[PDB]
DNA sequence: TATAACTTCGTATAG
DNA sequence: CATATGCTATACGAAGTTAT
DNA sequence: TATAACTTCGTATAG
DNA sequence: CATATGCTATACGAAGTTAT
DNA sequence: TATAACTTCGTATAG
DNA sequence: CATATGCTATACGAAGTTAT
DNA sequence: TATAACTTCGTATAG
DNA sequence: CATATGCTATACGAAGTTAT
């Protein structure tokens, strides 16, 4: 019990060992679990397996996604494991119910969704539509989409790019040094190469924004309504705004998304990453090169990305016709 | 103690944590193991290492495949793990004997089998023999085989398709939404498009069968001796019957099965997935594309199917023939 | 102590879990160690750390290779670990002296040797010389070298090939099923494709030898004095004889090897596996394709095989002389 | 406490189990750790996790690189493991801070450094600037730079070359036999061939220095201020002097380096290895041949060197520029 | 019975 | 050999050494 | 006596 | 870049075997 | 005082 | 997401079932 | 009335 | 094929913020 308090304090003390998003969800889940405990007369900590079981069953009846329910279970597991206590999932009651909730939801039609693909044909369409615009916001957005599609970088990684991270190949192509991604923490990092065309889009953005005035400036910054950019070395353009760029670009071409409240009605932050992975598969690029493009280490994760390859233009339709 | 009894109640209560197919195999292995134990004066639960070892040697002596023997071990392992008891696999005796058995069976020439391929050449031959057939039975079966080859869905998934899952592409093709995916993250996607030719076969079956009188009806239904189809929203055609279609089609072209009692002497449930994979390889479709077309995540599953194709003979052959 | 006895009994009773070669070397090491023990008044089992250290240092003074000394240590470790006793290498005296012996010997000039490469140029040369021969012995030997080079199979794997393991591709190339290799024991196994030229060499061997009389005959067999092959389903051509084909083929081209006592003066069993790896590196074959050819799982083992690439015709000399 | 005492004595007895460079670092880290402990009133041995944690945070604050902090942890780990003690790394507190330190340093912009490349263009330029010199020192330095670039040998390996390691091919080229390999299994091979031009550079040095008088003489030796070489069979040129050659050559061309005490402002001992790897990549030499040319075993070391060449820009760049 | 062409075996060493 | 887990090298400023 | 041209050393960090 | 673990192969001289 | 074009936030869900 | 580890499908002969 | 054409089932094995 | 572990990311509606 004194040990438990020690263990939690040690975890809190070295806070920055974890992603800030891990903490955010720990706290979000604890809040949800503690609120449910209070209303149902249960002790929130240590958590009893039968209580956790009941709580997961309640999340299922709320109609939450399997992955949501797993996230709640998982945060509860971590809180116990890192306290030095048994995990809820160490008991059959919890581990079996989680299995059950997954099978039942899937059998009822649930499957995990994926960002709408922003693909080469989309990039070309957007390029031809927007390339001539001299609005600073459009110059920015096109450079952003170019990088997103060319490097497959996640939006948080793109948001973190500083001017000093940009260098050049002998042949003129931009190279973006990346040191931290979702899966990589390294002082060696990776370089992401941009094509000659995407290099030009980025230079146009660097040129009208003036972000190069200080190499500590983040590459991307906000653009106020007077078409003026606000470079900054301390605030990133939010990943929310990067999502917004994808959504506004989709809206430009296809109009307003309907009102059904479903996710991925329009392009979102992961859309170019999914799109480029699909184009590479279709073009016959070798697995190891797809891996390198996306910073992936195994084939399963690649399959996760290309799982929704368009069927109508797929291999089997083309083979059967013509 | 009373712990195991509680663990087993939790298993029963949340029995939907496992597929019906998993339970049926657990019970089947349990009957075999208990029968053998009763015969040999051994306690069947908890399983003792020396006893499991002898049982596994008896399974080998019986002529069971390595993978069958693994199933028996795996099922006993699961019963024990979920009971909170030691696994048979976690012992020196069982570990050694499995190593021995694998080695001996491989040297004795035991081979893993796979479905006889149902390929484009086969599909075309059957088309040209059956497409004009008046028979309702034949119109159904051709549409089945076309969907099987075109989509690479498994028989259970084809049996699940409902009329309401079908829509039309702008190209005029049929598009089949997957109502229930095999897993939460559906490696094969959420829809399957049919070529123009296979769309025609399916349209034909729909119009002749009357299944579209009700959107909730399963696409496929039984057809009685009088050639009248019996559409239904509550009863699927069995996977057994779908295998019978593959077998009956093979019998049509090659006559009755050889008598060796081997598996895969005629086409079976898996035959069109193996065939389509082969046809895609022949056409130079990349491995990741082949894999998502059929929903595979393990490279070696697909390699087993395509490794005897000239296009897949490897670098040394290419090097020598240069 | 009763437990130790039971542990060894269990190891010996499933002796087939291990390779015949592992047992062969266990016994060879035990008699060396037991004999040294006898002569030095030590107890051979359990082995005391200070005595093992003394023994290792004596192996070193005998001028034995680092890999040999590691083999002796390793065999003692296994004997102990599978007794349920502490390994000699669990003590500092032993693990430390092993590192020391290896460091001192390397510092003094010792490096691991490798089979002399049998490469494409060597194969073409031998083929050009021998392809016109009508002696059964030559036809065999040419088919053997072709398989060895085309497939990289180790000689034991080549010795186990049976006639029934051979099939064909649609384009007419031979395929060889292999179920057991040094690193793989699988009922799925692996398929090894032959070029058209190599395929034609094996066909010639099959037709002159009559091995095809029984699909259970080994592909290669002894050929007596009179030029008559003696096919068998019961005895393999020994790996020693297969080494002899390599050594004899080397003598045919370069005459007698000198009298260094050194290994690898002439081609041996591993020569074509090494030579094929090297030709693939030099031709720019991708790492995955090299891996597939050798049935290797990682890059380090590939580097092990290509480590002695000729430097006189290597990349640096060529670059500098341009 | 007597076990630990014996364990350390065992470590002393088999000193030579580790490189002198490993011991030098163990002692250096122990000095730093014990000095910090005295200051902070902590017990230095056995090291407690809370204390090691505070120490690691102190190393971070000092501005030491991640890899340096790992060296300190690693050496404490070894000392504890070979003592029979709990390793600082095997504790919650140390695990958590290392994870935290890694993230924060990468986020602060810490970047791993890399030797300044000494490429073909540098080598040619140096040759044409210096080839008119008749000074013994210059002639040596030129021969040294040629060997460094041509062979990709490490400075310690170049310092160990004896005249008797050098023989001649039928091409007229010098061939350097590697007397002492880096490892038992030598990734770089057992010999290095010189181009004709670099052979000429080395002939000139041998002729002016008199090293060939005794074949046991090290190839390179010191040259005092009166331009007189001092051949030796028992004394090597230090690796520090070889670094000094690269440094002085850079200074001659570009003048004195920066005040900003950064690393790699001038060429150093690794420069020719990095340079030669880059020239090979530019020529289209495959990664594996590059790796064996420099004795590298890990693909990502090489990739670090060449990641900014247009040749290595990846699949997405290829797709977009098509 | 004489020998080509193997096999078997042990120590040794590579993968 | 497929896997598991750190050791062993270079970098470089400074200070010591030895023949000019 | 100044100095070139090293070697030795200890800490920092890459291979 | 390194070496460890717990194997499983090949190397080769020498001596034994058997159908000509 | 609007307003475009964001940022912040908390929950939900994918990778 | 990188990593570690078993579950969930089809195969098929046989025995039942139900509307012709 | 047999009977086509299924369905259900249990063990074997591939995905 | 499959799903668990222990994370670490994105999705997005809502509501709040600041140079114009
Ligand atoms: O035998 V090593 O591939
Ligand atoms: O973001 V997942 O590659």
Does ligand 2 have an atom closer than 6 angstroms to the CB of A154? yes
Task: Identify the CATH number of the domain defined by range B113-317.
Answer: 1.10.443.10
Cα D29 to Cα D79: distance, rounded to the nearest angstrom: 10
Q: Look at residue D72 and give its three-state secondary structure.
A: helix
Give the count of beta carbons closer than 10 Å to the beta carbon of residue A105: 19
Q: From the CB of residue D18, how many other CB atoms can be counted at a distance below 10 Å?
A: 19
**Rounded-to-integer distance, Cα A94 and Cα A57, Å:** 10
SS3 D142: helix
Secondary structure element (H or E) that encloses residue C57, with its range: helix C49-61
CA distance A172 to C88: 60
Nearest-5° Cα angle at C136, C131 to C140: 65
Return d(Cα B306, Cα C191) in angstroms, integer. Answer: 10
**Backbone CA torsion sign across C93, C96, C99, C105:** negative
Residues of A in contact with B192 (CB under 8 A): 311
Q: Residue C227: how many CA atoms within 13 Å on its side-chain side? A: 7
For strands B191-193 and B174-177, give the pairing: antiparallel
Q: Verify D-B touch: 3 or more CB pairs within 8 A.
A: no
| Distance of alpha carbon B137 from alpha carbon D50, whole angstroms | 77
- Residue B309 backbone dihedrals phi, psi, to 5 degrees: -95, 135
Tell me which residue of C226, C227, C249, C229 sits closest to C163, measured CA to CA: C229
What is the Cα–Cα distance from D288 to D285, expressed in whole angstroms? 8
Those residues with Cβ within 8 angstroms of residue C152's Cβ, 6 or more apart along the chain or in another chain: B316, C272, C273, C276, C277, C293, C294, C295
Q: Which ligand is nearest to the CA of A305?
A: 2
Could you say which nucleotides of strand I lie within 7 A of any protein CB atom? 3-15
CA distance D46 to chain C (A): 18
From C118's Cα to the closest Cα of chain B, the distance in A is 14
Geometric angle at alpha carbon A63, from A60 and A64, rounded to 5°: 75
Which atom of ligand 2 has the smallest separation from the CA of A270? 1
- Give every CB contact of residue C194 below 8 A, 6+ residues apart in sequence: B317, C146, C147, C150, C151, C173, C174, C175, C176, C202
Q: At A135, give phi and psi (nearest 5°).
A: -70, 130
Chain A, residues 267-306, CB within 8 A of chain C, namely 286-288
Catalytic one of A154, A160, A250, A278: A154
Query: How is chain D split into domains, by residue range?
Result: 1-111, 113-317
Q: At D117, give phi and psi (nearest 5°).
A: -70, 135
Burial class of A61 by CB neighbour count within 10 A (0 to 12, 13 to 18, 19+): exposed
**Cis-peptide, bond into residue A72, ω within 30° of zero:** no
B278 alpha carbon, distance to own chain's centre:
17
B207/B229 Cα distance (integer angstroms): 11
Sign (positive or negative) of CA dihedral C233, C235, C236, C242? negative
- DSSP H helices in B220-321: 239-254, 271-282, 287-294, 299-306, 315-321
Which residues face B223 on adjacent strands? B229
Nucleotide nearest to C102 (CA to C1'): H3
Whether A270 sits among the annotated catalytic residues: the reply is yes
Q: For residue A50, how far is its CA from the centre of ligand 2 (angstroms)?
A: 34
Which two structure tokens, joined as six digits, stand for A1? 């019990």
Closest CA to A97 of A52, A67, A63: A52
**How many whole angstroms separate alpha carbon D39 and alpha carbon D57?**
15
For residue D167, the surrounding DSSP H or E stretch is strand D166-168
What architecture does CATH give domain A113-315? Answer: Orthogonal Bundle (1.10)
- Residue whose pair of structure tokens reads 């090291």 in the numeric block: D47
How many of the other CB atoms lie within 10 Å of CB of C24? 10
What is the three-state SS of B206-227?
HHHHCHHHCCCCECCCCECCCC
Are the C-beta atoms of C243 and C270 separated by less than 8 Å? Answer: no
Close Cβ partners of C15 (under 8 Å, ≥ 6 residues apart) = C23
Q: State yes or no: cis peptide before B46, omega within 30 of 0.
A: yes
Q: Give the closest-approach CA distance of C212 to chain D in angstroms.
A: 41
Rounded CA gap, D202 and D174, in Å? 9
For chain A, the three-class secondary structure string (H helix, E strand, C coil) is CHHHHHHHHHHHHCHHHCCHHHHHHHHHHHHHHHHHHHHCCCCCCCCCHHHHHHHHHHHHHCCCCHHHHHHHHHHHHHHHHHHCCCCHHHCHHHHHHHHHHHHHHHHCCCCCCCCCCCCHHHHHHHHHHHCCCCCHHHHHHHHHHHHHHHHCCCHHHHHCCEHHHEEECCCCCEEEEEEECCCCEEEEEEEEECCHHHHHHHHHHHHHHCHHHCCCCECCCCECCCCCECCCCCCCCCHHHHHHHHHHHHHHHHCCCCCCCCCCCCCCCCHHHHHHHHHHHHHCCCHHHHHHHHCCCCHHHHHHHHCCCCCCCCHHHHHHCC
**Residue tagged 């060894």 (tokens):** C8
Question: What is the structure's resolution, reported in angstroms to one decimal?
Answer: 2.3
- Cα(D163)–Cα(D171) distance, rounded to whole angstroms? 19
Nearby residues of B26 by Cβ (< 8 Å), 6 or more positions away: B18, B75, B78, B79
Assess whether the region C1-111 and the region C113-315 belong to the same CATH fold: no
Distance between alpha carbon B6 and the CA centroid of its chain, in Å?
35
Long-range contacts of the stretch B280-285 (C-beta < 8 A, 24+): B280/A315, B280/A316, B280/A319, B281/B305, B281/B306, B281/B309, B281/B311, B281/B312, B282/B309, B282/B311, B283/A315, B283/A319, B284/A284, B284/B311, B285/A315
List, in sequence order, every residue forming a beta bridge with D193; answer none if it has no partner: D175
Whether C298 lines ligand 1, by a CB cut-off of 6 Å, is: no
Nucleotide nearest to B291 (CA to C1'): L1
Distance CA D282, CA C193 (A): 34
Structure tokens at C147: 């398989």
- N residues, chain B: 322
The CA-atom distances, in angstroms, between A87 and each of A5, A41, A45, D288 are: 16, 21, 11, 46
**Helices A2-13 & D92-107 angle (0-180, nearest 10):** 20
Q: How far apart are CA C274 and CA C119, in angstroms?
A: 8
Cβ burial B132-166 (10 Å sphere, 16+ → b, else e): eeeebbbbbbbbbbbbbbbbbbbbebbbbbbbebb
Cis peptide before C75 (omega within 30 of 0): no
Which two tokens mark B321? 């023939």
Contact B280, A302 (CB under 8 A): no
DSSP for residue C229: B
DSSP assignment of B28-89: HHHHHHHHHHHHHT--TTTTPHHHHHHHHHHHHHHT--HHHHHHHHHHHHHHHHHHTS--GG
| Cβ atoms D237, D220 nearer than 8 A | yes
| DSSP secondary structure code for residue C312 in this structure | T
> Which of C72, C80, C154, C250 is an active site residue?
C154
Distance in angstroms: CA B206, C1' J17: 27
CB of A78 nearer than 7 A to strand L: yes
Long-range contacts of A231-239 (CB under 8 A, 24+ apart): A233/A162, A236/A159, A236/A160, A237/A159, A238/A159, A239/A155, A239/A156, A239/A159, A239/A269
Residues composing chain D: 322
Residues in B 141-180 whose C-beta is less than 7 A from nucleic strand L are none
With beta carbons less than 8 A apart as the criterion, state whether A197 and D321 touch: yes
Dist. CA A133–CA A142, nearest whole Å = 10
Helix (H, G, I), strand (E, B) or coil at B244: helix
Angle, CA of C206, C207 and C211, to the nearest 5°: 45
Q: What value, to the nearest 5°, has the Cα angle with vertex D27 and ends D23 and D32? A: 150
Per the CB < 8 A criterion, the answer to whether A141 and A192 are in contact is no
H-run or E-run covering B105: helix B92-107
Question: Given 3-state DSSP classes, what are the helix, strand and coil percentages for chain C, each rounded to the nearest 5?
Answer: 60, 10, 35
The sign of the dihedral angle between the CA atoms of C197, C198, C200, C205 is positive
In this structure, are residues B87 and B49 in contact, taking their beta carbons and an 8 Å threshold? no
The residue with tokens 């902090």 is D69
> Can you list the positions of beta strands (E) in C154-260?
166-168, 174-181, 184-193
**Residue B289 per-residue DSSP state:** H
Chain A residues with CB-CB distance to B18 below 8 A:
99, 103
CB D135 within 8 A of CB D211: no
What are φ and ψ of residue B46, in 5° steps? -65, 140
Ligand with an atom nearest the CA of residue C298: 1
Chain D 115-154, residues with CB within 8 Å of chain C CB atoms: 120, 149-152
Residue whose token pair is 């497939």: C151
Nearest beta carbon to residue A302 from set B19, B180, B288: B288
Which CATH architecture group holds C1-111?
A: Orthogonal Bundle (1.10)
DSSP SS3 for B316: helix
- Cα–Cα nearest to A139, from A88, A185, A207, A226: A207
CA distances from B45 to B83, B85, B87, B93, D317 (A): 10, 10, 11, 17, 61
Residues 6+ apart with CB under 8 A from B295: B152, B182, B186, B187, B188, B189
Q: Which of C266, C260, C272, C261 is nearest to C247 (CA)?
A: C266
Residue D307 annotated among the catalytic residues of the structure: no
Helix or strand or coil: residue D197?
helix
| Beta pairing class for B166-168 and A185-193 | unpaired
C38 lines ligand 1 (CB under 6 A): no
Pairing of strands A166-168, A174-180: antiparallel
Instruction: Quote the radius of gyration of chain D (alpha carbons, Å).
Output: 24
| Rounded Cα distance, A162 and A226, in Å | 24
Give me B188's structure tokens.
Answer: 């094969």
CA-closest candidate to residue B124, choices B251, B258, B302, B249: B249
Tokens of D33: 């750790």
Which of B96, B110, B108, B112 has its CA nearest to residue B57? B96
Distance CA A67, CA A75 (A): 12
| Distance, CA of A9 to chain centre | 30
Instruction: Quickly tell me which residue has 């081979």 as its tokens.
Output: B111
Q: What string of H, E and C letters represents the secondary structure of B140-197?
A: HHHHHHHHHHHHCCCHHHHHHCEHHHEEECCCCCEEEECCCCCCCCCCCCCEEECCHH
Q: Which two tokens stand for residue D228?
A: 């007189």
């Amino acid at each position: 019990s004194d040990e438990v308090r020690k263990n939690l304090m040690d975890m809190f003390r070295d806070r920055q060992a974890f992603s800030e998003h891990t903490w955010k969800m720990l706290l979000s889940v604890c809040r949800s679990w503690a609120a449910w405990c209070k209303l149902n007369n249960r002790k929130w900590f240590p958590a009893e397996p039968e209580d956790v079981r009941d709580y997961l069953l309640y999340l299922q009846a709320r109609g939450l996604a399997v992955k949501t329910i797993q996230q709640h279970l998982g945060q509860l597991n971590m809180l116990h494991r890192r306290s030095g206590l048994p995990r809820p999932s160490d008991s059959n009651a919890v581990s079996l119910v989680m299995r059950r909730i997954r099978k039942e939801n899937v059998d009822a039609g649930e499957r995990a969704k994926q960002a709408l693909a922003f693909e080469r044909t989309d990039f070309d369409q957007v390029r031809s539509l927007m390339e001539n615009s001299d609005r600073c916001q459009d110059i920015r957005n096109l450079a952003f989409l170019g990088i997103a599609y060319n490097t497959l970088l996640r939006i948080a990684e793109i948001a973190r790019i500083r001017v000093k991270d940009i260098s050049r190949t002998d042949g003129g192509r931009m190279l973006i040094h990346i040191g931290r991604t979702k899966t990589l923490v390294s002082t060696a990092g990776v370089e992401k190469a941009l094509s000659l065309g995407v290099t030009k889009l980025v230079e146009r953005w660097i040129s009208v924004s003036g972000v190069a005035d200080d190499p500590n400036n983040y590459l991307f910054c906000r653009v106020r309504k007077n078409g003026v950019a606000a470079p900054s070395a301390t605030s990133q353009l939010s990943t929310r705004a990067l999502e917004g760029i994808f959504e506004a670009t989709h809206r430009l071409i296809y109009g307003a998304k309907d009102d059904s409240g479903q996710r991925y009605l329009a392009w979102s932050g992961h859309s170019a990453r999914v799109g480029a992975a699909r184009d590479m598969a279709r073009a016959g690029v070798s697995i190891p090169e797809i891996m390198q493009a996306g910073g992936w280490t195994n084939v399963n994760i690649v399959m996760n990305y290309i799982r929704n390859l368009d069927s109508e233009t797929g291999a089997m339709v083309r083979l059967l016709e013509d």
